[PDB]
Structure formats: structure tokens, C-alpha cells
């Protein structure tokens, strides 16, 4: 989930934008 | 700001800046 993708590894725009409504 | 480790409030702030008026979901586990 996000923590894995963006906290414990380096985040990206691609991935963050998936969580937008 | 997005291309780094983003945790806690720093993550939530990145989500807010990227998503703008869309909003988002932050779901830790």
C-alpha cells in the first residue's frame, strides 16, 4: 500500500496520484 | 517534493499538494 510505495521506499508521482479521488 | 521517502505528515502533505481539490485516501496498512 502507500507506506510501502512511498515511505519505506522512494515515492513517485505515478504512485501518489493513484490515491487521489 | 514527490521523489523521496515520504512518511507520516510528510506523505499526507505530498498527497494534498498532488491531488488538490480532488482529495485522496491515505491508508496505512
From Swiss-Prot, chain B:
Range within the parent protein: 25 to 53 of 110
Native species of this protein? Answer: Homo sapiens (Human)
Q: Which domain of life is it from?
A: Eukaryota
Quote the protein name from its UniProt record: Insulin B chain
State the gene name recorded for this protein.
Answer: INS
The record lists the effect of residue 10 to D as: In HPRI; Providence
Query: Where do the TM regions start and end?
Result: none
Amino acid at each position: 500500500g502507500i507506506v510501502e510505495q512511498c515511505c519505506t521506499s522512494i515515492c513517485s508521482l505515478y504512485q501518489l496520484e493513484n490515491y487521489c479521488n | 517534493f514527490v521523489n523521496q521517502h515520504l512518511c507520516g505528515s510528510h506523505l499526507v502533505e505530498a498527497l494534498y499538494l498532488v491531488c488538490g481539490e480532488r482529495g485522496f485516501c491515505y491508508t496505512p496498512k
